[PDB]
Write a protein that binds this ligand. Structure first.
Ligand SMILES: *[C@@H]1O[C@H](CO)[C@@H](O[C@@H]2O[C@H](CO)[C@H](O)[C@H](O)[C@H]2O)[C@H](O)[C@H]1NC(C)=O
Length: 130
């Protein structure tokens, strides 16, 4: 499913993502935008290290979810990677909260670093009523 910007903003707010681990909703919005264009079905395979990023947050199969075909996977979110391809993002959100509990926090998503860090991201939630 391809969320509409504000639809996503409110869905994320409902799920307690605003200010979670000190991360604003606008920052979460900027990262989902550049990681997947708000598409829950986005999948990106890395032929180099044989791992795949799944869902709206592009979470990695080596560390967070298990897809049965990734060498050295840890499955720290304790979910099937397929759970990150549902239209309902409750699972992807619970896993994204787990990802930020790492020392690097939100730096785990380089697309956040490239497109969100040190820029004005207030436009990602403007007009959404959140
Ligand atoms: C993207 O891949 C990163 C590795 O290139 C990964 O970062 C690693 O995550 C580990 C989790 O146990 C640990 O914190 C390493 O120190 C860290 O480098 C990052 O988590 C991945 N991002 C996503 C969204 O899955």
């Amino acid at each position: 499913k391809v969320f509409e910007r504000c639809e996503l903003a409110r869905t994320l707010k409902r799920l307690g993502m605003d200010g979670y681990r000190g991360i604003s909703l606008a920052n979460w919005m900027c990262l989902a935008k550049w990681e997947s264009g708000y598409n829950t079905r986005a999948t990106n395979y890395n032929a180099g290290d044989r791992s795949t990023d799944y869902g709206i947050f592009q979470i990695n199969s080596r560390y967070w979810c298990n897809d049965g075909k990734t060498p050295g996977a840890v499955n720290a979110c304790h979910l099937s990677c397929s759970a990150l391809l549902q239209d309902n993002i409750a699972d992807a959100v619970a896993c994204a909260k787990r990802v930020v509990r790492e020392p690097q926090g939100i730096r785990a998503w380089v697309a956040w670093r490239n497109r969100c860090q040190n820029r004005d991201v207030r436009q990602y939630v403007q007009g959404c009523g959140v």
